[PDB]
């Protein structure tokens, strides 16, 4: 049956039985059975029927072919059968607009759960079942003209998942492939992030140069993120053949240029981008799935010369290679041969990994190809008593976690059996190692022994953990672990330095995670002090052993187990300690005034709140008292009700929030705001944040308030809410009803001064002039006191 042939091809593709794959996009209007809207034949020169066996998957790429064309029944009842016989699968390609509302059956279904689920079945019946093919390929490109909305990409991804529940590896009908082709990186491809686990392949178009000396910069950088969503064996990269009459913007130069002296040049793969994609392999994960070509019906046509690369549809510059001609698919077949003869696709054999039980678990976990070995960068779990020998493990040189579970017949672990990534902090877990006789981890810069199950190593006869980065100090848990290893050796043998080697550690230095002083003190000694020196200092080991300064390190360097000193003699404090570069100290005085400085001078009774930062986060918070300290003032003006202003009433209310992301000005050089602190407390200072402190607009200092007066309602015996709106406003505007408590005659960015213990419920601040002719502005006002 023709549906069982197709089902079995898809299963042998999906299970990786084909080696490196080669795919091609065949443009429907270049099949000879294709007819346009007027019912006339478009091009007689080529036909899908002649696509060679070297093409593993053939993508029906549809345009210009009318819906009543003979092409469609010809494909269904003739092309599918001829191509299946040689082992070629047919896949239908549709654009994303057929899923997101913009085109086709998408326009006839609501954007609801039951609506998108009915749409999905309608797409699978219209584009897969009714056309006879072996799967579906969703084309997702950058739309530079009218971007897709977040709601459209959300719908396309919900429809795609409903499709993936019908066909593909997770679908009801696993005899069909489900594929995506794209031009978008992961950061720009939310549909890919959502559907990736349901894809057989991702086809990444990379026509033309992708940057850098080898022109593959974008391929390498993009693979670094695709590898978190798909396996390398699902990754296909694409080049394009030369399309006739291609204009600027569609001229990739992926194949060789026309040569008037050699009519066959277009079939020569030497020097082409196509050949480079054929040989390109990812740095991590595995070997790629293969390559694909756009416009496979143009296989072998020489590219139009570089001199023509500026032609456009209005500026036609026709060349000989724009003619249509019969192709015999030689370039395709050379590229497929180059890939299947590349020795990185030879299968891992016993010469790579001698132990059969080890070889089987590796192939099962990292892939089947020799080339997969040195690229794989994830986790390897090895289990059971059938593994006798770890030879070959060292070829997994990017392995990120090695996990040895109950390997009861392994006798030897040495650096030379281990991945080279073990020297750069790959994880190493080994449990139930009851047969282990030699445990050599020397020279691997291991920072702890965590994950090594030392209680289980009951047959140990020697170990070497020397030349690592361990902290074997008295309380380190790595010294407990070392002690068990030494006891294991001793049950079989007299302990010697060689069979229990652990010297020459060089433990790395880290920042302490917390600091002890929550409340510091200084006398009023009229001297300068450094808060980082005195309170936020030092370095820990990975096991949180604190070393405060260079003399604490010298004692540390003399640590010994049984009189054997385990720290390298030439390890220096400079190489161990953290330098604290870029650390910054934020101080808040009892003022509520703020400064950034690690130095304080103890001239008077004060209290700062200290926030220590490393350039990114707050590492430490403490209070510092100088002398007997000082009580912390509050901003009593916080949230003060505005009761009157010569400006706008709701711009005025923003000078009493907490922020500087706003500005208050009026049309002119003078204004006033009158406010009510509500309760009636004691005020000692005031602070004005001038125009240039604005955190929402870069504001220059020429807009700063330069003259002003802060005032108190002079008569306390008056009910301001018994006056009516208009009288109230003119009372508040009349200067003889206000007493000054503070002047300002400098256009500082932040202005602060003290008040003679002012007790007032009602206040008014007046801008009397600006730093320039511009309207003066300011962002925030504070009245600082107690209660
Ligand atoms: C995976 C990939 O490679 N992606 C893109 C490639 O697409 C791209 O190659 C180009 O592809 C063009 C077609 O693009 C279609 O797909 C993309 C991507 O999905 C869409 O963005 C695009 O909009 C196209 O989508 C198609 O839309 C139609 C309409 O909505 C759909 O048809 C609908 O189908 C439904 C369901 O079946 C329903 O039936 C509707 O009724 C129906 O309307 C269709 O399904 C959909 N297809 C897909 C797959 O989604 C190509 O056009 C372009 O090739 C042209 O240009 C090159 C040179 O640059 C030529 O070599 C080539 O032959 C072709 O030229 C055109 O030829 C026709 C036939 O002769 C000309 O028509 C005649 O021209 C005369 C000229 O005087 C008259 O005007 C006459 O009236 C007319 O009949 C036509 O004018 C020619 N046009 C030009 C410009 O020359 C190319 O292959 C590549 C770019 O390299 O980029 C990849 O990223
Ligand atoms: Ca404000």
UniProtKB/Swiss-Prot annotation:
Chain intervals for the UniProt region annotation (carbohydrate-binding module (CBM)): 633-787
Localization per record: Secreted; Host extracellular space
InterPro entries xrefs: EndoS-like_Ig-like, EndoS_F2-like_TIM-barrel, Glyco_hydro_18_chit_AS, Glycoside_hydrolase_SF, LRR_dom_sf
GH18 domain location: 20-327
Outcome after substituting residue 775 to A: Abolished endoglucosidase activity; abolished activity on both high-mannose and complex-type glycans
Pfam family, one: TIM-barrel_EndoS
LRR repeats: 288-311, 373-396, 397-420, 433-456, 457-480
Similarity remark: Belongs to the glycosyl hydrolase 18 family.
Functional description taken from the UniProt entry: Endoglucosidase that acts as a host immune evasion factor by mediating hydrolysis of the N-linked glycan from the Fc region of host immunoglobulin-gamma (IgG) during infection. Specifically catalyzes the hydrolysis of the beta-1,4 linkage between the first two N-acetylglucosamine residues of the complex-type N-linked glycan located on 'Asn-297' of the Fc region of IgG antibodies (IGHG1, IGHG2, IGHG3 or IGHG4), thereby preventing interaction between IgGs and Fc receptors and ability to activate the complement pathway.
UniProt-recorded name of the protein: Endo-beta-N-acetylglucosaminidase EndoS2
